[PDB]
Design a protein around this motif. Structure first.
Motif, short mmCIF file in Angstrom:
data_model
loop_
_atom_site.label_atom_id
_atom_site.label_comp_id
_atom_site.label_asym_id
_atom_site.label_seq_id
_atom_site.Cartn_x
_atom_site.Cartn_y
_atom_site.Cartn_z
N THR A 21 -42.59 -56.36 53.74
CA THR A 21 -43.66 -55.67 53.00
C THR A 21 -43.66 -54.56 53.10
OG1 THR A 21 -45.38 -57.73 53.79
CG2 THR A 21 -46.42 -55.38 52.78
N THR A 142 -51.45 -55.94 55.53
CA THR A 142 -52.00 -57.34 55.35
C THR A 142 -52.73 -57.59 54.98
OG1 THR A 142 -50.53 -57.59 57.05
CG2 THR A 142 -49.33 -57.27 55.56
N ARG A 145 -53.10 -62.20 55.59
CA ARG A 145 -52.30 -63.14 56.22
C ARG A 145 -53.47 -62.07 58.43
NH1 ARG A 145 -47.02 -61.77 59.81
NH2 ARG A 145 -47.25 -63.08 61.69
#
Length: 164
Positions: A21, A142, A145
């Protein structure tokens, strides 16, 4: 559910060198290869890691091998780290998986800097800690997550992953 199932949901599985990412070169189940911008550096690390000429691609088999080593390393790094081991030992089985997941993603070092949150988890102040963990780069970069990990620390159940 177990730590392997959990990380495999969070990380996915990719048989070809790919970027994080974060833009880093990775392969398998979230196995970072290098932070360096050359695919050539990445490729070389790859071959070093598997012990063959892979030309940028691995089998499932190899991916899981790496994954087994990486999980083992995360647990061992938690145990070796005084601050980490302390919180680890204080936690129940499910919440221990949440700490392992953070360490796998961010490294021993990164997690150890979550000083205030670690303190709260130790004290079993679940709601407070969940609010503190969310104030981080980690959460903003993120969010989906981080939020599954966080619900895990909050509840002590695997519900965030039931969906998934």
């Amino acid at each position: 559910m177990n730590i392997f199932e959990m990380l495999r949901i969070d990380e996915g599985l990719r048989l070809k060198i790919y970027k994080d990412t974060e833009g880093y070169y990775t392969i398998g189940i979230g196995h970072l290869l290098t932070k360096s911008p050359s695919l050539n550096a990445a490729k070389s690390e790859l071959d070093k890691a598997i012990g063959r000429n892979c030309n940028g691609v691995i089998t499932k088999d190899e991916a899981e091998k790496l994954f087994n080593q990486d999980v083992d390393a995360a647990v061992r790094g938690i145990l070796r780290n005084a601050k980490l081991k302390r919180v680890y030992d204080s936690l129940d089985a499910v919440r221990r998986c949440a700490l392992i997941n953070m360490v796998f993603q961010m490294g021993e070092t990164g997690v150890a800097g979550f000083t205030n949150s670690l303190r709260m988890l130790q004290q079993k102040r679940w709601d407070e800690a969940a609010v503190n963990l969310a104030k981080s780069r980690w959460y903003n970069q993120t969010p989906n997550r981080a939020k599954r990990v966080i619900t895990t620390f909050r509840t002590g159940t695997w519900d965030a992953y039931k969906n998934l």
